[model samples]
Target: MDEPDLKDLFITVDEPESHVTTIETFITYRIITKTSRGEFDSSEFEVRRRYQDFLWLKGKLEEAHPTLIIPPLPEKFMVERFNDDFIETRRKALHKFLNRIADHPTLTFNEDFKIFLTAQAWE
Candidate 1:
């Protein structure tokens, strides 16, 4: 019923870049955002965010809107390995999660969501 408003914004979870460090190896996904919304500075944006950042957004959305049902992140496996198949599955899950959030009328206007889509360095 409320899907018409979602036409103005688009987001894709793609391009996984793995960063290896002595302490740990983590991966960040590139969020390719294209929108006609006024809150964003440009029509298209690209930002890299890790899995932890998605968790942070989930927490924040839940905190801000208690009445709403925030989307769940994919489950973590303790013995999981960072391979091609693993990363692809996670990327698809993240993509689904993000589209769910974007589809919601209220969530589309979230301040944190805006920052998450556009910010290059948001730590």
Candidate 2:
């Protein structure tokens, strides 16, 4: 069977507001995408990521595709890393970063992004 347009592959990230005990929320997301064999069964894999994980993804992507320009990292002021305002801002920026990578012609078809999204291991 032939594959559908690559643009049909979809994934999005989001973070929900918390009720209490909220300081330095790391990351929150729900990934939904169509498989190469044509299945959007990749359900709502809600997960959280850290700065280190983002760095890991960036490093891995850099190693995997040396020729393509990787997207920029989200800004994080060390002094305010735990502040609510800072966390909210970083989340927005990180979401944008993920979407850009999702839309990249080359990256959208790559496995590194797949691993980055689904991986459960981190240091």
Candidate 3:
């Protein structure tokens, strides 16, 4: 199968922070996207998404492209879950996961991926 070539797109994950709500609270990380693709209106973007969002994106990708290998998220449950070390580890995992997808020639062009990077409010 022919693959789409995207040479100007770049993504990096960092800065996991807490988002508290009346019902529940969760951690979210910053997904910094920089690209020159004409499909995107801006040359760069900064978006935030939590673990569930990442999982949703993974699922969406799996369904959209049945034959590609999707990058897995870090373990949801780990010892010392709230410790700073744990948070750092999770950040690293998420970072790796996003970069893996960004590096994929075809996956980089997926609509959902584009939306995830550019959409200010994905909820």
Candidate 4:
């Protein structure tokens, strides 16, 4: 089994919860991942962000790096709602999207992706 160049770092998103206020309530996400092999070796961290914030980060990444094809986001709904069903589905999609970006040769090396996954309150 010839192992070509590969990344040991893995990415995942989870623990989506909501915070409510009078004006509105926002869903927050926690992204967790671990380094299977590398300098860090078995290190993991969780970063939190809102769905809207993820959209902005995606836009910023695209603006700075046009060559890389960022993963497509889950389609927005005409009716806005943040029920558990929607949040769970969105969480899975976000996880898949993050891993998709992580798979890219160029995108994996981008600071924006790293910041998105690792930066606490990455605003």
How high is each candidate's TM-score?
0.80, 0.64, 0.80, 0.75
Candidate 4 deviant stretches above 4 angstroms = 1-6, 21-23, 37-40, 77-80, 121-123
Estimate the lDDT of model 1.
0.82
What tens digits encode model 4's per-residue C-alpha lDDT throughout 1-123? 954544656877888877677987888888876766466435676788788877876787788778767677866551345777888888988888778767767767777777777776432
Best-performing candidate as measured by lDDT: 1
lDDT of 2 by residue, 35-78 (tens): 33444533333345665666777777778789987898855234
Task: State the lDDT of candidate 3 residue by residue for 1-123, as single tens digits.
Answer: 954544566777887888888987778888887776566454777899887888889999999989977988757442365578877888888888888888888887799988888888432
Error of 4 at 111 (Å): 0.8
Clashing pairs in 3: none
lDDT of every predicted structure (CA atoms) = 0.82, 0.61, 0.80, 0.74
Q: Candidate 1: which stretches are off by over 4 Å?
A: 1-7, 36-42, 77-79, 121-123
Model 2's C-alpha root-mean-square deviation from the true structure amounts to 5.6
Model 2 clashing residue pairs (backbone): none
- Model 2 ranges with Cα > 4 A deviation: 1-9, 16-43, 74-79, 121-123
